[PDB]
Amino acid sequence: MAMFMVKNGNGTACIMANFSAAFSVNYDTKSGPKNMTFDLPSDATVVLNRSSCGKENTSDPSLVIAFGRGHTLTLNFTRNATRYSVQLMSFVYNLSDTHLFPNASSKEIKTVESITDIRADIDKKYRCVSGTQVHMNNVTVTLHDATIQAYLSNSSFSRGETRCEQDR
């Protein structure tokens, strides 16, 4: 149904998302500061044990995507009676991955976080074709051709949509 899905106990999707993510990472190298661009690979998968549909009093919905050599992109959701959003986007990247980060002077696992402008009405999906930008420390994450929805009661996207301001 979607590229990334988080399923509830009864096998029904609670979060569904499509997008192609473009990253830009300024990292510290032995010969200076370097910029690195890459996409979220076509083989990135949903981490089932870290993804959540929410737990009473304990947690809120999350989509955790694992990619490459020890990296994760997380989308944490929040809501009120009528609206919902990705309240926090987390990017965890292993600087010891020599494919994305060659000559890196640090082999540290970096974690960056930011509030996103990804928001939609409840029972509508967020839609952004031109791409939504998330600026974190040294990181820019652009989600292209995005369709994201949380608080789903079915394994299907609602017909209603809340378009991003960038599209118009």
């Binding site: 009473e56 809501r79 009120n80 009676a81 409840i122 029972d123 608080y151 009661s153």
Partner: protein
């Protein structure tokens, strides 16, 4: 296993406030809103408002804002609907509904009856009535009363009338049945009236 269990019936004096509850289970409480809907013979179905438990964000209808107050408690998965300045027009069955906004996934509670009246809980007096046989259930408050025939054996031809409000603020009804004229001597008839509000249980055998 979605379940919404509403509090029991209430009898409220005019001008008083009432607070009805709705306990949820079988689903993630913070994944949906809880809506409240009034069902009355006078105004049919009316959306009152909804509350997002977890934040407490509550949109109200134009008619019920101020009049109704919705609260939520995530520790016990329970929602509350408080109503102020009670008047006769507030007598109705109030439903709690688990939904976000799409009614395709709405689950309805069993309802809670609120009777607004200054009368006191009084038990009914059971008087007796092809032949037609029955029994009159007079001067009782509040609704409802349950009437069965032959401990539930006699169901065909039974007509239990909707109660009517008398000038005294008390209710009165009749439950009748049409049985063949031959079966009068042989089969005897028992009407079983149960007024749970006053814990009254009266069994009445009907004969001439």
């Amino acid at each position: 296993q979605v379940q919404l269990v509403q509090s029991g019936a209430e009898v409220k004096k005019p001008g008083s406030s009432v607070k009805v509850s709705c306990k949820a289970s079988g689903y993630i409480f913070t994944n949906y809103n809880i809506h409240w809907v009034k069902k009355s013979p006078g105004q049919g179905l009316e959306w009152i408002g909804a509350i997002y438990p977890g934040n407490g964000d509550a949109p109200y209808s134009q008619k019920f804002q101020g009049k109704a107050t919705l609260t939520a408690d995530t520790s016990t998965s329970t929602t509350y609907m408080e109503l102020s300045s009670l008047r006769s027009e507030d007598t109705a069955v109030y439903y709690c509904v688990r939904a976000n906004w799409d009614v395709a996934f709405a689950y309805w509670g069993q309802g809670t009856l609120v009777t607004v009246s200054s009368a006191s809980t009084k038990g009914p007096s059971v008087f007796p009535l092809t032949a037609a046989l029955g029994c009159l259930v007079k001067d009782y408050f509040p609704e409802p009363v349950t009437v069965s025939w032959n401990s539930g054996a006699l169901t065909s031809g039974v007509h239990t009338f909707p109660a009517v409000l008398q000038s005294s603020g008390l209710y009165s009804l009749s439950s009748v049945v049409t049985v063949p004229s031959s079966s009068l001597g042989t089969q005897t008839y028992i009407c079983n009236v149960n007024h749970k509000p006053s814990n009254t249980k009266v069994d009445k055998k009907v004969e001439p």
